[PDB]
Symmetry: C3
Subunit: 277 residues, 3 copies
Amino acid sequence: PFITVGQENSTSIDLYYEDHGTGQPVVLIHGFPLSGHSWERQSAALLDAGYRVITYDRRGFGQSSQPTTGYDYDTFAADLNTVLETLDLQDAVLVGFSMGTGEVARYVSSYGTARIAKVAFLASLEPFLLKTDDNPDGAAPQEFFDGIVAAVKADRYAFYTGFFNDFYNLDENLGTRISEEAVRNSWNTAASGGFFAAAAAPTTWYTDFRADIPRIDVPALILHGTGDRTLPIENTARVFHKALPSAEYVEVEGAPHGLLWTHAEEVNTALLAFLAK
Amino acid sequence: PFITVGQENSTSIDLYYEDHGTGQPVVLIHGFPLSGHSWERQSAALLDAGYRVITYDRRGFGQSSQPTTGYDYDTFAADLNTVLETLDLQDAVLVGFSMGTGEVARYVSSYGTARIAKVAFLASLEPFLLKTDDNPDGAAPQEFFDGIVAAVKADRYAFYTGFFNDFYNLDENLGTRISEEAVRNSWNTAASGGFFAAAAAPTTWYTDFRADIPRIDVPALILHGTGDRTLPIENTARVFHKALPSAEYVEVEGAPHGLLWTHAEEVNTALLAFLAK
Amino acid sequence: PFITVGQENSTSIDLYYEDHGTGQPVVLIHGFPLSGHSWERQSAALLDAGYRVITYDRRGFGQSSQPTTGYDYDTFAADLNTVLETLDLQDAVLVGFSMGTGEVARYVSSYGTARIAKVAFLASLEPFLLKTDDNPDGAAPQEFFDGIVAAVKADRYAFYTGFFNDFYNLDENLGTRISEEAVRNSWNTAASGGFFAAAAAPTTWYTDFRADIPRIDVPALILHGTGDRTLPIENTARVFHKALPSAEYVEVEGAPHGLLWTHAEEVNTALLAFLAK
């Protein structure tokens, strides 16, 4: 299925989406460099629990179009907006994972919560990963991001490999929590995203969501893996919770970045309890 | 190419199909967890032999849509019906492989043979794989199927690997009858099917086709690999032939489940002789 | 995005294409058994340089339809024509790599250069790879091509593997100029092209472009890897340059066939200088 969000030269920009089950609508917003398909462990539990599950592939990823434009949180938020309005979702739950948590903050902040019942942030970017003078808690200096960009441009194929190692803590989880086949599928999904999007995505990672946070109006859930090597729990989740005290917060003991797969359980159990309420 | 068979929430359910060559129409119905593309060795021989070759991806597989509904032989048969009627196929040959043989029985049985000239069953499910009191010849107890479902839900990626081993008798055929690259392509195809369809398919495997058989009206071919580790020739092909004495029957000596690839020859030669008549 | 070029039985024949950037239009025509995506190193440099980049997947490859018809340079040239006319490209640069250089010669020759500003031939087929009495410089006897066809039909999966070895000079370049992940992506792309197209493509390789050459009207660039194991520089580039003295010509010292990736640099630098003029 596709939803058209714009135009690029002679072609339109279409997002691949899926719409399963019946019940209260839950929209899942994937992380880099994956696709809506990465939520399969969560989707099955929500379907069983009796929710309507909406997944979509961000522009440049999985089965969506691969323009060379619109790689920024406002565009991504506007893309989300079009999906919501296209489907006329009411009383929806927005769940973002990694990059997806930037969409959740930015949409709520700009568009408001009229269609939105609750939000959930898993392995969040928030509040601001750039380490500055004004942002002391930031996870890295600008030079560091500039780094990743350079690495993806040099050979994103080879890049994906080192990325998944840390994404999943493979030195700990391989053959235990994650099969080699599961990791194979992940690399294939990434290799399938647009070359341009691959190098342009890392630049959206240090977007400042500090002014988005106060706008979160509806009940929220913050969930982070304490073994997160990709988004240090101390520069993210921990400072985010201070910014939104109100958020229900769950720490997944020794879970890596890729906790959707390695700790699907602990993830499903927090998720379903938070949505139950 | 797509043919729309239904609607799921806000999206339609579309089946990916291909239509090649000219001549008498031959429709190929693939097995789990593959796609219309798995018939490539057979398609080339039919094309050379002068037939019109129609392939399609069952819902949840290859390039078709991945709903979370309709995983049962009546739906699958109705999906087939729509294809036949969409293309206005007349005097068609229906060839099913593994799961596909459930479509052939069920369509013939419910819809009749007005568009149908002949049928062929390769590595068949028939007549009833569930081992019961009334079905003594059944290949396994219910607990066994329940088993597979559980295994696919746990990590279908990793599952595909053990599956292909037995599917192809890789301990015997690897590097001989099947290349490692050929097996790689198979895993990629499966990893590409819908997560839901993967776990829901195994439940359609013990459908009782006992009352479908008497309805087969047109000339039939039954072909099985005697080294079939997936569908024991003794619980399937052998009891099916007793149920349809009339069927022309070919045993492929030491061929595994995956005989379309490992024994493409012996397969093409039986197929082309049966269609020639 | 798709552009429909024809009809095959009940289905249309659609070519997958991309249209990025703004500026003078540059159309990239990929080689066997790849797709428009193989130009990613070149596309990024052109985008940065300020060009409009058009890529498309030849029929039977990458994301285009997979008919069992039209595998010949006139059809391929007519396919190109439809793209050009569909987008109303004016003052376009046509860049072909390997197989793509057959499209560039054939289109220019038959349709003329009214929409065309310049052409570039990388790892070219020209002028005639068939070794005959009249074509002494030909790279191989007919028996040799017949060879490849037979090999692809036998197991194209396994075939791709040996192909990429020579395509990339992996014995020299692996772990240096090309990562194992980069090669993995290439095999996956090829495995994804149509089975029919795979075996039918090699027959278009010894098309005689000897009468096409005199028709090249606009400024041209000829670029070849001196370590080309796929298209011997001595039977191709070197005799082509004699046929078109006028062409600007660049030899890439010890570059294999797959120079777009291994020598992206030397490639981008020649390309951008030639387009700059």
